[PDB]
Write a protein that binds this ligand. Sequence first.
Ligand code: VO4
Ligand code: NI
Ligand SMILES: [Zn+2]
Ligand SMILES: [Zn+2]
Length: 413
Amino acid sequence: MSKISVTVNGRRYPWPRVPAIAVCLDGCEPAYLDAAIDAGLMPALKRIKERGAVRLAHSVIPSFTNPNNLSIATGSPPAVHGICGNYLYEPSTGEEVMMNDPKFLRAPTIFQAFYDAGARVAVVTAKDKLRALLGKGLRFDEGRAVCFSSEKSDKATRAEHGIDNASAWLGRPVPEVYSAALSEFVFAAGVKLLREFRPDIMYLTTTDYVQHKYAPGVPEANSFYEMFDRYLAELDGLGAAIVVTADHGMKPKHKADGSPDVIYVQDLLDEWLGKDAARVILPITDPYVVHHGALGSFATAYLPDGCDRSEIMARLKAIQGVDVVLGREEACRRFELPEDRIGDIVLVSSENKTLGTSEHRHDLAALDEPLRSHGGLTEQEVPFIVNRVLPELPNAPRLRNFDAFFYAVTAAA
Ligand code: VO4
Ligand code: NI
Ligand SMILES: [Zn+2]
Ligand SMILES: [Zn+2]
């Protein structure tokens, strides 16, 4: 007998004999897990690590939520699926269109590929805009797919989500968006789906609310992972093959005084090239939000015609805090990004600095806690833990977070 498989974006996925689950712990710097385990708060993960396969994997660069979640969902980098930020910039017209609608996804998900082959597939996200992206190509008329978010769980319908009101179904209220509970709801939904729906393939993804606010090992961070461990214990106990990984890590990005340490890339380009001659894009989050939430460690810039790119790149690279400056061609090759959705230059900042646009209008420092963020090479390294024996499993840099499903189904097969 030849074995059954599903081929997705040039990778062959064996059919899982038991449910195959990937859990994306948003912003989970490996240190978070080390600290919670050391505090005796994660007995299940502690045992799973001991008896399973423990690795570190490399995220996609930019180490942001959407590019990484979509890489995990498709088993491919942004050069294939097309989601390399939160919004793209039109060189002419000067228009900014969003990178949140599914029509911008250019490759099928593993979920669709398995669904189309007859599998039972489940996707639970914390935020609803990711739900729509991740759910592309799923159908809800055969009782074989479930896809909803914690955020809009009470709005779920059979015809569009595969379930009528996930809040009522789970027996928990819709959580606050800015809360640990938004992620807890995902884990609880995942367990109930495993019990009652028995998916062949399931993805659970969360938010990095807690991680942006609290460093590894502080009480509020520890309590989050303590909470997660309970659900991990239940999933593991139910017999699923599980990969626990993250979309990206998290580092402190604040000066000694606790204020954001920022390099304002637009200001610098204004002086050298003329005001608004170039356009700096910060892919971390939506461009019409200004409350310190738009600070990450990766930026791209669209330069005016007939300017010296090589000269502009050399000046930025000389700045302390700017670790990597590359042209579109080199950046797309190196980070595996699509050329048609990236600027003329790509900038990556140092470990404890971020990249902003300009100081005129600035970015409003609203929340108190010292800045923590991601996007750079220093948030690329993520945990990759499997609850099965897998001695051949590679390690970083060969192992990617978007190998999660490949190894989940392999472990399940
Ligand atoms: O939604 V994010 O983990 O790129 O802040
Ligand atoms: Ni909850
Ligand atoms: Zn994230
Ligand atoms: Zn984040």
